[PDB]
Amino acid sequence: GLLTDKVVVISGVGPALGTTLARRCAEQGADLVLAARTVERLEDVAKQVTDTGRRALSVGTDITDDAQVAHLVDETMKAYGRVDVVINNAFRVPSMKPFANTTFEHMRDAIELTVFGALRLIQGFTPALEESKGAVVNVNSMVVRHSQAKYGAYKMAKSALLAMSQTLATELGEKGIRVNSVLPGYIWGGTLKSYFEHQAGKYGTSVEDIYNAAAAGSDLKRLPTEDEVASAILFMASDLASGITGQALDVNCGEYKA
């Protein structure tokens, strides 16, 4: 029972880590608020939550919009009257392009969602988190640990997010609110597998070849799973981490070390 009787808000619930996270939080005793633009996706996630016997509030939210984040906060406080944890899940799909071929509009949009969206959420729920002495976990990315070609827009936005997360730990720490980051690389599950299958066919190779190439830089020679990344997020969200704020915990089977 890591999260018994806590309310956890997850923004950016997709079919992969987001769904695993919602399920895992519920298994650990949390009730959920699920936020995403497309509310049809939240329906099955909510079922996995309610199957554990917990509650799920699903709220269609564009976190780039002030009114919509205000509505999410209002609906949450109406349904539960409290928030213990806010998780900003990394939903936006990165495009591998060198900066030379990346549009400025794309990078502005990436910052809008990844940085300002997360800030809007955190700020919206600051009053709730002040009362609960709660925790924020921002899902970041291994991309901040390297400078590989074509990862620039993604590294830029994620780096701005990491920097913001760090300042927020300082600024919200006097209210007793913890703010940490979890930095996964590739995350193995059904979604990444389908993607590797597409890549395998498109490049005339095997999924094993693609998987092994992706995992080769790691110490363990395996990619972390959705559950393994979720476990790190749950730890940071929980009272096991009550002494921990301002930190980035990398979940990457050792590929980059910090």
Contacts with Cl ion by CB under 5 A lie at: 14, 16-18
The string of DSSP codes covering 6-65 is -EEEEES--TTHHHHHHHHHHHTT-EEEEEES-HHHHHHHHHHHHHTT--EEEEE--TT-
Q: What is the DSSP letter of 133?
A: T
Alpha-carbon distance 34 to 133, whole Å? 21
Residue 246 binds: one of Cl ion, its own copies, none (C-beta under 5 to 8 A by kind): its own copies
Alpha-carbon distance 89 to 63, whole Å? 12
Q: By C-beta, is 59 or 229 nearer to its own copies? A: 229
Residue 125 binds: one of Cl ion, its own copies, none (C-beta under 5 to 8 A by kind): none
Residue 199 binds: one of Cl ion, its own copies, none (C-beta under 5 to 8 A by kind): none
For the chain, how long is the longest CA-to-CA vector? Answer: 55
Query: What are the angstrom distances between the C-alpha of 209 and each of 65, 115, 204, 214?
Result: 42, 34, 10, 9
Q: Least distance to Cl ion from the beta carbon of 19, Å? A: 6
Q: How far, rounded to the nearest angstrom, does the alpha carbon of residue 243 sit from its chain's CA centroid?
A: 21
Q: Least distance to its own copies from the beta carbon of 60, Å? A: 22
Q: By C-beta, is 200 or 217 nearer to its own copies? A: 217
Question: Under the rule (CB under 8 A), what is the footprint of its own copies?
Answer: 98-100, 104, 107-108, 111, 115-116, 119, 123, 126, 144, 147-149, 151-152, 155-160, 162-164, 166-174, 176, 178, 184, 218-221, 224-225, 228-229, 231-232, 234-235, 239-254, 256-258
The residue of the chain with the least Cβ separation from Cl ion equals 14
Q: Least distance to Cl ion from the beta carbon of 10, Å? A: 9
Q: What is the residue type of 13?
A: V
Alpha-carbon distance 104 to 125, whole Å? 30
Residue 16 binds: one of Cl ion, its own copies, none (C-beta under 5 to 8 A by kind): Cl ion
Residue 18 binds: one of Cl ion, its own copies, none (C-beta under 5 to 8 A by kind): Cl ion
